[PDB]
Design a protein around this motif. Structure first.
Motif, mmCIF file in Angstrom:
data_model
loop_
_atom_site.group_PDB
_atom_site.id
_atom_site.type_symbol
_atom_site.label_atom_id
_atom_site.label_comp_id
_atom_site.label_asym_id
_atom_site.label_seq_id
_atom_site.Cartn_x
_atom_site.Cartn_y
_atom_site.Cartn_z
ATOM 1 N N UNK B 40 0.813 -1.217 0.000
ATOM 2 C CA UNK B 40 0.000 0.000 0.000
ATOM 3 C C UNK B 40 0.858 1.284 0.000
ATOM 4 N N UNK B 41 0.125 2.442 -0.067
ATOM 5 C CA UNK B 41 0.733 3.694 0.064
ATOM 6 C C UNK B 41 0.055 4.677 1.025
ATOM 7 N N UNK B 42 0.140 5.977 0.709
ATOM 8 C CA UNK B 42 -0.354 7.026 1.627
ATOM 9 C C UNK B 42 -1.678 7.591 1.227
ATOM 10 N N UNK B 108 5.590 -8.995 -6.976
ATOM 11 C CA UNK B 108 5.380 -7.805 -6.174
ATOM 12 C C UNK B 108 4.488 -6.825 -6.885
ATOM 13 N N UNK B 109 3.475 -6.297 -6.187
ATOM 14 C CA UNK B 109 2.707 -5.156 -6.729
ATOM 15 C C UNK B 109 2.647 -4.137 -5.604
ATOM 16 N N UNK B 110 2.686 -2.873 -6.024
ATOM 17 C CA UNK B 110 2.678 -1.733 -5.113
ATOM 18 C C UNK B 110 1.832 -0.612 -5.663
ATOM 19 N N UNK B 111 1.238 0.159 -4.759
ATOM 20 C CA UNK B 111 0.425 1.360 -5.020
ATOM 21 C C UNK B 111 1.025 2.560 -4.273
ATOM 22 N N UNK B 112 1.190 3.689 -4.975
ATOM 23 C CA UNK B 112 1.604 4.957 -4.338
ATOM 24 C C UNK B 112 2.937 4.698 -3.645
ATOM 25 N N UNK B 113 3.113 5.029 -2.366
ATOM 26 C CA UNK B 113 4.465 4.903 -1.797
ATOM 27 C C UNK B 113 4.980 3.465 -1.924
ATOM 28 N N UNK B 281 -9.748 7.187 -10.517
ATOM 29 C CA UNK B 281 -8.796 8.117 -9.999
ATOM 30 C C UNK B 281 -7.551 7.392 -9.487
ATOM 31 N N UNK B 282 -6.929 7.944 -8.457
ATOM 32 C CA UNK B 282 -5.650 7.405 -7.944
ATOM 33 C C UNK B 282 -5.789 6.064 -7.264
#
Ligand SMILES: [Cl-]
Ligand SMILES: [Cl-]
Ligand code: NI
Ligand code: NI
Lengths: 294, 304
Positions: B40-42, B108-113, B281-282
């Motif tokens: 995850x991210x912020x 690996x998958x990531x969003x934002x930070x 959106x984001x």
């Protein structure tokens, strides 16, 4: 009992509550001679001129005014284009005030936001001015055109305070006294409040404590990001230059000001941002010399 | 009695606090198959994956981790360079966590930070990864190079949260619940909280209500303005590209597209990259969960 009995930092000056079509301007008025209007910026009030105004008052009628919506001046209602807090609107308002005082033509020195008022007044209505001084600024257009990482990080507040209401206002409300004191400290040379008279800091703190005053400051920055920027962009596109004799002082730029002004002098002053308080003697002397020349 | 009593957004998934040399990482772990770490991210936590995690758990061992210093992970002591909250250090720590779980290689998958962690990990340690997905980002370097008046106004928080302590911390104390809710709503298509499960919003709110957690977030943005930028700039100057097979997904109205066309940027950074927009959106996995899960499943899975 509608105003706090704060310290008097201009002995001998009178107080004026000056009518305008957008509200009253508060000013201290001292000296005798040709009129010289002095305009403060953020997060200050007219008291910031307290160390230089006595010197200037030897030779000039010194009018030391709270910008529209700052300090003790009235706060006109704003709109979605932040109109009354645009530098164009503030300039028109201050012209009204000076006309009340008996002055259709005057000399002008501004610092920070007041310097923005001043160069915009010189672009829009040059005939009003004999001579102009701006302290520690470049045009608003120039700050935005140069925006990059380094500047985004240094002048973050131009983008934070310009976010749509109520975001900045809700954040500033937690601990306003911390924010204002740390802002004043952080752009001095020393990085502390040692440069300021504590009585002046109290004026600043009392202003900043009022949520309505803080909302005005945010509207000012919202103008700064939007309408003021567009106003400057129009002048850049037509290569419009100020014809008024001008002095640019900055804390240790004249090359930027030549693009915007056809008769400009400059000098560095040994100071951080707050020239009139950090370097009062050097600032006073530069202004006395400039404004006494004919 | 100190925990709030909250419903399980990942039914069937285990809960693990995984030791590392820097502190524990909290994760939910579910499913069956080869490992897939989701970051995850912020201003979120691992719960943001709760609508795509079940679909991915059909074919993968899904490990849904709180970043260092976020959620229920431990908060490593920072320093003047914000080292533990740099994406380089976060990557190293999450590698330790995966190794404790028995995975020396993983997807690996990531969003934002968390996507910034993920591409940094692929740059620094490509041999760890089978496949990488980044969601709604460009590299940190690319945001900064594009930081003109319009972007400075749009992503002001990049500069605000990066101011030296205690400036943003003391401001955020002013009304933290308003701040997090406004951040979440502002980057959605509707501009409100309607895309989010209210139970996930409560997770985010509870995290953001903690001053120690908000301090972490600021340290993350400080790292993003300073060391993380410098680490990127080194790779850009050298022409270093990510060699791992990669997927860039972005919101048609998200942050990455705001001032770029994202696939061509990522091709400057990666030699084997595919990409596509998602109608969102984001917050891709919450705003567009079906579309996002399908994209992810297709990219990571060898079966059609
Ligand atoms: Cl005129
Ligand atoms: Cl490697
Ligand atoms: Ni009264
Ligand atoms: Ni308890």
């Amino acid at each position: 009992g509608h105003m706090p009995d704060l310290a008097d930092l201009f002995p001998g000056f009178g107080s004026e509550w000056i009518n305008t079509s957008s509200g009253r301007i508060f000013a201290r008025v001292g000296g005798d001679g040709p009129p010289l209007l002095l305009l403060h910026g953020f997060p200050q009030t007219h008291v910031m001129w307290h160390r230089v105004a006595p010197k200037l008052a030897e030779r000039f009628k010194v009018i030391v005014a709270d910008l529209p919506g700052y300090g003790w001046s009235d706060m006109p209602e704003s709109d979605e284009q932040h109109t009354p807090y645009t530098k164009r609107a503030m300039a028109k308002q201050l012209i009204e005030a000076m006309e009340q005082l008996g002055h259709v033509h005057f000399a002008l020195a501004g610092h920070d936001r007041g310097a923005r008022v001043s160069y915009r007044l010189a672009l829009d209505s040059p005939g009003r001015l004999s001579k102009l001084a701006v302290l520690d600024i470049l045009p608003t257009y120039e700050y935005w055109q140069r925006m990059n990482r380094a500047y985004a990080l240094k002048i973050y507040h131009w983008s934070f305070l310009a976010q749509p209401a109520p975001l900045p206002e809700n954040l500033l409300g937690g601990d306003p006294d911390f924010y204002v004191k740390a802002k004043l400290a952080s752009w001095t040379r020393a990085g502390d409040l040692s440069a300021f008279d504590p009585r002046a800091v109290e004026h600043y703190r009392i202003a900043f404590a009022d949520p309505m005053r803080r909302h005005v400051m945010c509207e000012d920055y919202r103008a700064g990001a939007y309408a003021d920027f567009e106003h400057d962009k129009i002048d850049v596109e037509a290569g419009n230059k100020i014809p008024v004799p001008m002095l640019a002082l900055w804390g240790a730029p004249l090359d930027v000001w030549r693009k915007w002004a056809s008769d400009v002098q400059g000098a560095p002053i040994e100071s951080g941002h707050f020239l009139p308080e950090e370097a009062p003697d050097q600032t006073a002397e530069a202004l006395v010399r400039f404004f006494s020349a004919a």
